[PDB]
């Protein structure tokens, strides 16, 4: 029973590999010979947000490019005004450990999650004038690694029990479930049209899920180690992934394989966060060696380096209008690069 | 209007700043313990004496939060990186089927050699000493080096204990000590202790180690040790 299925699976994998090699007419590094260089991008640290006590783990820019939410391990959740460097809200959390935080597209809700397996959604309306728990979600058995708001009433969550979930905030019930992974799922990224999304796990595979149907379509296995970071290219038809192997890989949704691999011989450190720019020409990658490398996303060359941090860069965020780039690290500082 | 907002945000900033200057004082004074242990061992007993469990107590007017890892997945390689800011990691192994002690040695070795856990000290309890006393009549089948082992003369025994059982105790201790000494590098230290299934002075032992860790931390700053 197992032999006729495993050998068939090996045949199907070989068929997929041969289909990829059949469509591999030329690589991205061949048809981009006559492309102008981006030159040396020398970004300057403009602001320095200093409010957190413990290490800052994750952050997420808002859709207005004005406010940003930052989550630390001290149990505080702080909302920063990027212009005036004023702390707008400080929320004390019931648990100490936080691994994810998300700022709603409308700006009404802030969600936070951690090891506690409880996703707390906070309403920023507060006509009384004090923050309060709107609703908490407890339907996971591992740890909550990443969450993102589709809209006001729907939120996608990623857990450490090899499954992803889609919640309804009003009812507090699971709409559906995503059971395709065989390892810890680290992070996810939403497409601009909020129709499809990819999820990267610790089995070196990336799954493309249909939100409405509830099934996965594609599996990309181009990495050697655990995939930590994942970010959609601004057109929604490509995405780049960052694994522990120290190489970045760019995947396409229509070519069904990798387009280019980013690597440097003097870099052997892990990748913690990636994010594209507004145009998509620059790709910002936060590495374990205390700096952020600016990769040319069509030539595989280093534009510049952001060596402002004194400790491991944990999170990187780019604004929707490309006006600034904020990086958060374990030195409890937020560096806003111009 | 343009001035009113730019005064309101100043007052909001100052109120949040004062709140963080009241909470920072609490944060920097309270110590944090991670009670990471094998399932076989009596971890629940140590806790007595959702995903994560929390214990809050105080000894000698010093606050201790001890965190019990509950219903998680066995793959530790990701979430353990959140535990590089605790004051001490308590590691408890029951000196009792598989070779659970070998798995414990491998786990301790991986924690010790971990890049992001080089600035954390580990407190070590060897549980089920009474069971070791009970095993002298009924071990040495899995360890061919127990025969070629002598009792260290610089460690005094306790009255009534069978010297063969104390030989087993010191062999188990030295197995962890060799790995701790070889790969330590002097930045962080390990502290082995003994404990029974029912004992009340262990908490005091933790206090008598945690202060020592903090003292050594200051002595790292002054370049004295």
């Amino acid at each position, epitope marked *: 029973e197992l032999d006729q299925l495993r050998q068939e699976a090996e045949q199907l994998k070989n068929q997929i590999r041969d289909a990829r090699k059949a469509c591999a007419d030329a690589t991205l590094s061949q048809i981009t010979n006559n492309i102008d260089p981006v030159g040396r991008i020398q970004m300057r640290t403009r602001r320095t947000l200093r409010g957190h006590l413990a290490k800052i783990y994750a952050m997420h820019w808002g859709t207005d490019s004005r406010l940003l939410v930052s989550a630390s391990q001290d149990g505080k959740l702080i909302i920063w005004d990027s212009y005036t460097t004023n702390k707008v809200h400080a929320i004390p959390l019931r648990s100490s450990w936080v691994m994810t935080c998300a700022y709603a597209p409308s700006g009404n809700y802030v969600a936070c999650g951690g090891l506690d397996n409880i996703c707390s959604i906070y309403n920023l309306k507060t006509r009384e004038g004090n923050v309060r728990v709107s609703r908490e979600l407890a339907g996971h058995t591992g740890y909550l690694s990443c969450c993102r708001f589709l809209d006001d009433n729907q939120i996608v969550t990623s857990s450490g029990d090899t499954t992803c979930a889609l919640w309804d905030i009003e009812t507090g019930q699971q709409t559906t479930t995503f059971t395709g992974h065989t390892g810890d799922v680290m992070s996810l990224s939403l497409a601009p049209d909020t129709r499809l999304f990819v999820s990267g796990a610790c089995d070196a595979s990336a799954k493309l899920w249909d939100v409405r149907e509830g099934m996965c379509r594609q599996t990309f296995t181009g990495h*050697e180690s655990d995939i930590n970071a994942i970010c959609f290219f601004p057109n929604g038809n490509a995405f780049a992934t960052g694994s522990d192997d120290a190489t970045c890989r760019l995947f396409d949704l229509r070519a069904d394989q990798e387009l280019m691999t980013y690597s440097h011989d003097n870099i052997i450190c892990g990748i913690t966060s990636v994010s594209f720019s507004k145009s998509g020409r620059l790709l910002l990658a936060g590495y374990d060696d205390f700096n952020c490398n600016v990769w040319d996303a069509l030539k595989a060359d280093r534009a510049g380096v952001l060596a402002g941090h004194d400790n491991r860069v944990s999170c990187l965020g780019v604004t929707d209008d490309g006006m600034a780039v904020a990086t958060g690290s374990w030195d409890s500082f937020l560096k806003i690069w111009n | 209007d343009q001035r009113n907002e730019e005064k309101a945000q100043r007052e909001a900033n100052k109120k949040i700043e004062k709140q963080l200057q009241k909470d920072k004082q609490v944060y920097r004074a309270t110590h944090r313990l991670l009670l990471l242990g094998a399932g076989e061992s009596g971890k629940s007993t140590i806790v007595k004496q959702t995903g994560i469990f929390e214990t809050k107590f105080q000894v000698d007017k010093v606050n201790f939060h001890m965190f019990d890892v509950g219903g998680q997945r066995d793959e530790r390689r990701k979430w353990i990186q959140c535990f590089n800011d605790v004051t001490a990691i308590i590691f408890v192994v029951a000196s009792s089927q598989t070779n659970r002690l*070998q798995e414990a040695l491998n786990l301790f070795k991986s924690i010790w050699n971990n890049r992001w856990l080089r600035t954390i000290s580990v407190i070590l309890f060897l549980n089920k000493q009474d069971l070791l006393a009970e095993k002298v009549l009924a071990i040495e089948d899995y360890f061919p080096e127990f025969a070629r082992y002598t009792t260290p003369e610089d460690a005094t025994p306790e009255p009534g204990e069978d010297p063969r059982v104390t030989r087993a105790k010191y062999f188990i201790r030295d197995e962890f000590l060799r790995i701790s000494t070889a790969s330590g590098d002097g930045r962080h230290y390990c502290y082995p202790h003994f404990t029974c299934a029912v004992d009340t002075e262990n908490i005091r032992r933790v206090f008598n180690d945690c202060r020592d860790i903090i003292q050594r931390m200051h002595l790292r700053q002054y370049e004295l040790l």
Partner: nanobody
Amino acid sequence: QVQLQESGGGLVQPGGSLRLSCAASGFTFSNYKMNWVRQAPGKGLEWVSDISQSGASISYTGSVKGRFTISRDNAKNTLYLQMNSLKPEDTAVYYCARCPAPFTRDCFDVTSTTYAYRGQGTQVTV
């Protein structure tokens, strides 16, 4: 695609000799520490032996210390296990396991809960 294909095995008598092979395809073999883990019937996973990137630092389990010989071949990226002085109590399923991270010393591969970085396994019976 990271794939491992263990090779060798069969029914042997106590006192015989047997070798193993581990085909490492789809990753940079020369930069990963690897090891052998086994599953005894009716027992949980237990560590057998390991080998570093260079091959200098080698360690075994106490029971099988001095009885087995691990050898890594970076020329053909194949891991070889030689087994001498076989015992009727060493029958188990063997797992050629890989450590997840490059250029490191620590490994976390004692997970029975569908750990994705081990092969399908091979059977040794005495």
